[PDB]
Amino acid sequence: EFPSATAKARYVRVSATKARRVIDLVRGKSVEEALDILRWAPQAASEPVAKVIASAAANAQNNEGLDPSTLVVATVYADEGPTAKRIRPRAQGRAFRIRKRTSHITVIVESRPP
Amino acid sequence: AVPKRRMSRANTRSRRAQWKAEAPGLVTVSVAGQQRKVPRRLLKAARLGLVDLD
Amino acid sequence: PKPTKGPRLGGSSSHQSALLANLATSLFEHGRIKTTEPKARALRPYAEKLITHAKKGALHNRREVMKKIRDKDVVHTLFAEIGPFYADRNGGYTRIIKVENRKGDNAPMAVIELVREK
Amino acid sequence: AKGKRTFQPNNRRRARVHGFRLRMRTRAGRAIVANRRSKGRRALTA
RNA sequence: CAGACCACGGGAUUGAUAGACCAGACCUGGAAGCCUAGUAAUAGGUGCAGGGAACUGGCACUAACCGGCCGAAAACUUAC
RNA sequence: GAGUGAGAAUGCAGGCAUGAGUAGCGAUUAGGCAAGUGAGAACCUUGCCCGCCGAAAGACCAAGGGUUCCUGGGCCAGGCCAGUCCGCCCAGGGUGAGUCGGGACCUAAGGCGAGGCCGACAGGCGUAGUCGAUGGACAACGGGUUGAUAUUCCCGUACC
RNA sequence: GGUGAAAAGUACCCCGGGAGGGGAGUGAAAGAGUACCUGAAACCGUGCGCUUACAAUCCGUCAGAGCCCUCGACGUGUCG
RNA sequence: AAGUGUUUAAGGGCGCAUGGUGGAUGCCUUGGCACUGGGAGCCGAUGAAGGACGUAGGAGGCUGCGAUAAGCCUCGGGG
């Protein structure tokens, strides 16, 4: 098994789907390429995703003593976390529900020999 | 109008998969002796120092 | 120049006129200005027409520029530094450089500068 | 338009129409005060 | 001039693609300044003037980048 | 011995999906640039420019709200986005009157009303009275000051 | 309403502005981290296996090709 | 020379593994419900019931208590 390091960004104030939109971009790529794509991705969800990927890389470097250049985004996924319920008033005094969703973005970077 | 049936999982996901981001095409730029990746669109700006590469 | 094909840049023709005038004033003042790429694209012909008037240094061209710029300091800057500077350059007095988009709306951004290589 | 809502606040009128003195004036209002006191209302009246 | 978001032309300049610039065309209609005539409104000369866009030519002056992604055969049976 | 079996009651509650990353993001003014701050800025600060109202979209009183005011901090909730900002969050501070507006002065409509009259009881009225401003009477104006109060504080000069 | 027996409530270091994590430590257990006993379904992912872009499907049921694992004759892949 | 022929998954389905959300289930409890046996069966102009505002060194709620204000005195219990 490849030496892996984990990083979970929990309760991120972004939808699980909107985090997944960029996690799909940077799943499978090396850590460096993933961070570059998340740097130049126009989606705002790329910033928490980039931060959690970089945290996984930092854990691999410091807590695990792995070579940062050999790291790769092995398994990354955003699960949906808690959802706050808000009320938006609409016409005729009718209250519609608004969902302030969060996401847990889990990242596991492995150190693979190219 | 209003949706008459609940959409099946297969259809919902088939048509939801189309809401995907397109990864930017990154080219190499040498700035401050370092090789960074920037869009070819921002290649000139990065060379001239008009891109914040952090 | 050629008119804006699509909806005017400031949300109206009057606002587009005022916005191009302000952008030209700012460009002639600070050398380079960062603004949304569409504004830079619309300004570059506008600004270069003003610089052409400046190059044709005359009272008539001064009046033609002042009917758009309205800033006497920037008009003097044009007719005393930018016209003489571009006397030898035939067109292409401005340069658009595409830069990163804004964090609040992802608007395409561009820095429009005055050419200086000569 | 005529967008006048039903409730037009007025503290003096609120006190003079639903206040403690008016409630205690009549046995029915005294009954209301007693019923609220038994229910446990913190605000027995306006 | 192709377009809701595609695809078509040009381009990693071995380039007129767009803009600018220079002309032409065309539209307006005689600019500003100065001079002259009128106590003035205003008129006349400078002068087919000035201004300006889409069309047409020139012109690499500005931007088309010292760039990244995709993108090749499993073979077998049967006459000459 | 049963609160003993749910899939239906346009059943009830809680959590979620579908539409959907869709509509919308709330007028009829409009923002731009430079610099700053900051991790982060279309939205905050500053400087210009531009635009909008201007019998107001300016400045006050009243009602109503109740601390939302000022200073310093905060930015995971709210703000239809973000936010370093905010009427949001936290702490502290802030409201100074013989003259202003009220009460201590009057009464109007109306209310309540000692007794009282009427009414099986409950109570309905009501006199004397007593409340009751939206009205009457009633002595102060300029200037300055604070981060936040100002005919209140201060200065000058007035009036019960 | 429910952390834990006991706050012993995670020192210290690292990524991060924080939030949140990763080491480390406490604990019998953080598969107990003040979002906390157990942690169902709905619902939402990620990984793997088969399948699916000539097809008309109350979505199943009966046959059923083709694609992995449990015991052995045999000695090794074709049977049951 | 004609014919035969596996080979893709933008996405989807099924299943398994592994998670998240959520708060069901199980086991509980600080709280209720229904009663049993007793006490007392009234309080108040010596101002009741119930409250408003205050009160502790520090902000608020609940509790207690009233400018003697989480309290004062006397008598008892306990250490």
C19-30: burial string, b at 16+ Cβ within 10 Å, e else: bbbbbbbbbbee
Cα–Cα distance, C27 to C112 (Å, whole number): 8
Does B45 lie at the interface with C, CB-CB under 8 angstroms? yes
Q: Is residue C16 within 8 Å of C9, Cβ to Cβ?
A: yes
Does B48 lie at the interface with C, CB-CB under 8 angstroms? yes
Cα–Cα distance, A49 to C28 (Å, whole number): 42
- The residues facing A7 across adjacent strands are A107
Q: Is residue A103 within 8 Å of A19, Cβ to Cβ?
A: yes
B36 → chain A, closest CA residue: A36
CA separation (Å) from C30 to B37, B41, C7, C17? 30, 24, 28, 20
Cα–Cα distance, A42 to C107 (Å, whole number): 10
- The residues facing A71 across adjacent strands are A111
**Helix, strand or coil for residue C108?**
coil
Map out the domains of chain D with their CATH numbers: 1-46 (1.10.287.3980)
The C-alpha R_g of chain A, in whole angstroms, comes to: 17
Count structural domains, chain B. 1
Q: Give me the torsion for CA of B33, C109, C78, C8, rounded to 10°.
A: 170
Cβ neighbors of A104 (< 8 A, separation 6 or more) are A8, A9, A10, A11, A12, A78, A79, A80, A81
Backbone angles phi and psi of A88, in degrees to 5: -110, 125
Cα–Cα distance, A78 to A18 (Å, whole number): 9
Nearest to A25 by CA among B22, C106, C11: B22
Does C90 lie at the interface with A, CB-CB under 8 angstroms? no
What is the token pair recorded at A91? 């016409």
Sign of CA dihedral C10, C70, C109, C112: positive
Cβ neighbors of A107 (< 8 A, separation 6 or more) are A6, A7, A8, A9, A52, A53, A55, A56, A73, A75, A76
Q: Is residue A110 within 8 Å of A94, Cβ to Cβ?
A: no
- Any idea what the CATH number is for the domain that residue A64 is in? 3.90.470.10
Query: Which residues of A spanning 54-83 put their CB closer than 7 angstroms to strand H?
Result: 79-83
Instruction: Write out residues whose CB is closer than 7 A to strand G.
Output: A 5-13, 16-17, 20, 24, 27, 48, 51-52, 54-55, 58-59, 61-64, 75, 77-80, 82; B 9, 12-13
C88 CB and strand E closer than 7 A: no
Distance between B25 CA and the closest CA of chain A, angstroms = 8
**Helix, strand or coil for residue C16?**
helix
C-alpha A106 chain-centroid distance: 6
Q: What is the 3-state secondary structure (H, E, C) of D3-35?
A: CCCCCCCCHHHHHHHHCHHHHHHCHHHHHHHHH
Q: Identify the helix (H) or strand (E) that includes residue C8.
A: none
Does C106 lie at the interface with A, CB-CB under 8 angstroms? yes
Ordered by start, the domain boundaries in chain C are: 1-118
Cα–Cα distance, B45 to B51 (Å, whole number): 6
Nearest to C101 by CA among A46, B33, B36: A46
Q: Is residue C54 within 8 Å of C61, Cβ to Cβ?
A: yes
Cβ neighbors of A49 (< 8 A, separation 6 or more) are A9, A19, A22, A23, A26, A38, A76, A78, A105
C1-118 topology per CATH: 50s Ribosomal Protein L17; Chain: A, (3.90.1030)
Cβ neighbors of A52 (< 8 A, separation 6 or more) are A7, A8, A9, A105, A106, A107
The structure was resolved experimentally with cryo-EM
Q: Is residue B23 within 8 Å of B32, Cβ to Cβ?
A: no
Nearest to C93 by CA among C58, C43, C51, C53: C51
Nearest to B44 by CA among C100, C107, C31, C48: C100
Count structural domains, chain A. 1
